[PDB]
Amino acid sequence: ITALETAIILIAFVVVASVFAFTILSAGTFSTERGKEAVYAGLSEVRSSIEIKGSVVIIGE
Amino acid sequence: ITALETAIILIAFVVVASVFAFTILSAGTFSTERGKEAVYAGLSEVRSSIEIKGSVVIIGE
């Protein structure tokens, strides 16, 4: 459980994990944020309908 | 070390999720169409009646 050459090796893995962690954070932020406009967009369509009102009139020339 | 494997398992689930998402996307469209025809078919049947006007006449040989 004791060695000196392990010093170089341990530095390699901690760097890789840190870089990998960085990518996950950025990817997670992008992924989660795409989620929210999907629901925000969805509420818009169901609300946006219009309706005809009155009676239709036709004019002859 | 642990960073390397978690990449592989991560890719596995996103692919399964996407494939399931595509299938559940594809299936939802089909079910929607069938429900639409039922309403159209039902309305047409109710409005297709026929009456009888006048008397009934017998011609004797």
B5-27: b (≥16 Cβ within 10 Å) or e: eeeeeeeeeeeeeeeeeeeeeee
In the numeric block, which tokens belong to residue B18? 């996407």
What are the phi and psi torsion angles at A15 (to 5°)?
A: -65, -45
The residue to which tokens 């009676």 are assigned: A55
Alpha-carbon span B1 to A55, nearest angstrom: 74
A13 and B3 within 8 Å at the Cβ level: the answer is yes
Q: How many CA atoms lie within 13 A of B43 on its CB side?
A: 4
B7 and A20 within 8 Å at the Cβ level: the answer is yes
In the numeric block, which tokens belong to residue B40? 């159209």
Contact B3, A17 (CB under 8 A): yes
Contact B2, A16 (CB under 8 A): no
Q: How far is residue A8 from each of residues A12, A17, B24, measured CA to CA in Å?
A: 7, 15, 50
Q: Which positions 1-60 of A are in contact with B (Cβ < 8 Å)?
A: 13, 16-17, 20
The residue to which tokens 């992008």 are assigned: A30
